[PDB]
Design a protein around this ligand. Structure first.
Ligand code: CU
Ligand code: CU
Ligand code: CU
Ligand code: ZN
Ligand code: ZN
Ligand code: ZN
Ligand code: ZN
Ligand code: ZN
Ligand code: ZN
Ligand code: ZN
Ligand code: ZN
Ligand code: ZN
Lengths: 335, 335, 335
């Protein structure tokens, strides 16, 4: 079947954007070809210069989001340049068999491999590195992203009515485990290998030092805030490959949410806060009705405000007093 | 639209009670007016005299539950008396825009403000303080409660059949972060400000010292147990503004549960244990069939029994041997 | 009603197997009689000889799975031999009243008791020990298992179509709290009582030392891997009596999942990772389509790989290249 289908090649884009794609499509199934190149690198993850000996797909945390339609085949070329130190692989939660592909994509530095799998189920699915004996370290060091498999006729509400988004953003949340020295300051390592032993000790405490969206505290704030306008519906894809999170839009809602991320199930409506299980990706739609700067955050507020799991969305448009009005501004208590 | 509606004024009551209200109603939309007054105070939170430098809406943890119907407007006057030290605000998860209202309700000591918003979605929603730069501290120190927005035609099961409750109770669960001194004993602070730095250090460990319902270990036990009778349906509203919890009724069930708390979604039935995401409120209905003293608790049993996240419900009525019978009482093993 | 029904006696089997039973049945309700005998024992829980002063139903962690049909009565004889040191009891989450039965099954060493209850709701339900004042310790030391109450007409999908399994396995996941000495090595205790105080201190940190399936690191690996074949549908019952978990089948899916474990609710389809709330049991069906050795694990990968929460399923059959194909094996990057 796959050998008789047309092929297409998709160029990936850096998070938090998602590569252009159709939602409902008249196209039949295709072999959709992607390539990713692993990059190990030291990254600065907070405002006080703390560094992570990181590992990435395509130079970014998260890796890029791959979008296909249900019934397509994903054909990924995974490249591990000779400038990297470690072996890598890929486990697609959207794929059937061979440990998600990991058994077939074991690439040492200087190697590449090509895997094909049928994307037979709709949803947002995590992909991550999974090299034998080193899985949690590679994942928490940054090697995860999302595969979104759209239903061929687009998204649907619980009664089967059409849903859509006008803009998509992808948020990868990363629980980091940065070791400290005897002085209480975070350790800086010269090489990736030297970070291993100390990092495993922090991991085993189950207590992250930092929890960041898209690779660093404040990654999605200031000039790098997400953007939208009143009337626009945004899709927020949220992946967490290792630890639970509870997304929330301050002053908004999840109008329609697939917290388990699987589009053949009916979504829930009107959520204040939703739940992404560690090892999954979920998806929320929201149509903005008020302008302003929103926060999109993990609603364990310590994780958000102290540890880093928060971003901003700057929304243009006209304020609606029907929805919310300041009746009396802060003023002295009448006596 | 809102400017042409009638106004009503509601008098709030202290948890765990909820102010009188209708479920299904023939009334049209109203502007429903509430007032809350912030009180900072030192509170004793356990049986060994540990104290929390607390911050409250209306003197209680949680704050009172506010009940309206879908399509009503909530009009809250938030008062911050000059006897308090800190600025405060309110973020309603049920409200659209301006960071849930927080941008419009920033009150220094000696000030008050009035906010109106349309309650356009049914469910139980958390409200909490959210002052710039101090959000997690205010929330974990006690500044949260629930807004319940009932569907105008009352609660419905998945097939659209009517559901009801005869009595409602509101439970706010609070993960507390009380610092210790070099002797291993909990610290007592003279003022709220002096507790800040040490508390933030405990918060960042993500490990609560205590987890309490309604402000203290044992708050909902003894003379202050919740009460019901065989045949009565109770609504248990459970809010957790910062951390996940897993409610459970020992010897009972969640007959119908909205764990994400949003009434336009179908509830689940027959739950043993349900899940309240940090930053949300959920709702369970149960119709008692046996008398006795039940426990209602967070089913991480360490959190419940060691840290404080448990209460009691004392139920009157007639024992049903069909449902459960002691066939043979404890007795020596036959030999 | 119960006094006029026929009785049946079921012989329990050791996890991960489940005793033979019917799914859809033409039988009417019965009194189904079971017996369990508590065994306290020291168990080796990891590969470096760490020991747990354990407490078990029937000598195993978890206890055996009990299977009945909705409307049956469960009649359990709980025996606490005089060779044990502690009092015990049983709390069935499937039972109504008397703290799940615990008030009626309080057995000192040398005693036994018989409890009957109506299994009026379908689902997988946790049962655990719950002795007054000692509940969390008994639970985390190993005293939990699953009662599965099948609908009398078998499992159903969201449209009411029949679902089935060909094989069932039961996985109990146990968060353990093993104390350490001043040398940093795990403590070995001569008796169960001597482990108590130190264990409670570890419990209160909320950080498990180990998290194991079925009593030990690697319990469900090697010769003790679960088994299946391509085309077979397996039911995976997963219980966690104290702490949340997030099951995942690497290279598979939860085809149909009741994550809250209650069969009268519609299942979700196509899950990558699902969520078992602490204090509950859930159920997933999967039909294997590829052969190979799968991992079934908690997808907090630190919990799985570092702490022990992972097992294997070895699947026989023919590889399907349509579903997944290695297009290009690992090879040097072309230059
Ligand atoms: Cu890797
Ligand atoms: Cu405040
Ligand atoms: Cu026991
Ligand atoms: Zn081809
Ligand atoms: Zn649109
Ligand atoms: Zn995975
Ligand atoms: Zn008016
Ligand atoms: Zn009633
Ligand atoms: Zn909030
Ligand atoms: Zn009989
Ligand atoms: Zn079959
Ligand atoms: Zn229980």
């Amino acid at each position: 079947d796959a050998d008789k289908l047309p092929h297409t090649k998709v160029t990936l884009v850096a998070p938090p954007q998602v590569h252009p794609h159709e939602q409902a499509t008249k196209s039949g199934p295709k072999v959709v070809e992607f390539t990713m190149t692993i990059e190990e690198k030291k990254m600065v993850i907070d405002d006080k210069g703390t560094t992570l000996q990181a590992m990435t797909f395509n130079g970014s945390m998260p890796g890029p989001t791959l979008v296909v339609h249900e019934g397509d085949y994903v054909q990924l070329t995974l490249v591990n340049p000779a400038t990297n130190a470690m072996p890598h692989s890929v486990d697609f939660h959207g794929a059937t068999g061979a440990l998600g592909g990991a058994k077939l994509t074991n690439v040492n530095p200087g190697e590449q491999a090509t895997l094909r799998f049928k994307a037979d189920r709709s949803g947002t699915f995590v992909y991550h590195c999974a090299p034998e004996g080193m899985v949690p370290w590679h994942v928490v060091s940054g090697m995860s992203g999302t595969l979104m498999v759209l239903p061929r006729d687009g998204l649907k509400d619980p009664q089967g009515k059409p849903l859509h988004y006008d803009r998509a953003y992808t948020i990868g949340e990363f629980d980091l485990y940065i070791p400290k020295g005897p002085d209480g300051k975070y350790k800086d390592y010269a090489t990736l290998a030297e970070s291993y032993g100390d990092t495993v000790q922090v991991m085993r405490t189950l207590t992250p030092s930092h929890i960041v969206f898209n690779g660093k505290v404040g990654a999605l704030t200031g000039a790098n805030a997400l953007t939208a306008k009143v009337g626009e519906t945004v899709l927020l894809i949220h992946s967490q490959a290792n630890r639970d999170t509870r997304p929330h839009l301050i002053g908004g809602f999840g109008d329609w949410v697939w917290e388990t991320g699987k589009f053949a199930n009916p979504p829930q409506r009107d959520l204040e806060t939703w739940f992404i299980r560690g090892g999954s990706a979920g998806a929320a739609l929201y149509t903005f009705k008020q302008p302003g700067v929103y926060a999109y955050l993990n609603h364990n507020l310590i994780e958000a405000f102290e540890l880093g799991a928060a971003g901003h969305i700057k929304v243009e448009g006209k304020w609606n007093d029907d929805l919310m009005k300041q009746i009396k501004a802060p003023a002295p208590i009448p006596r």
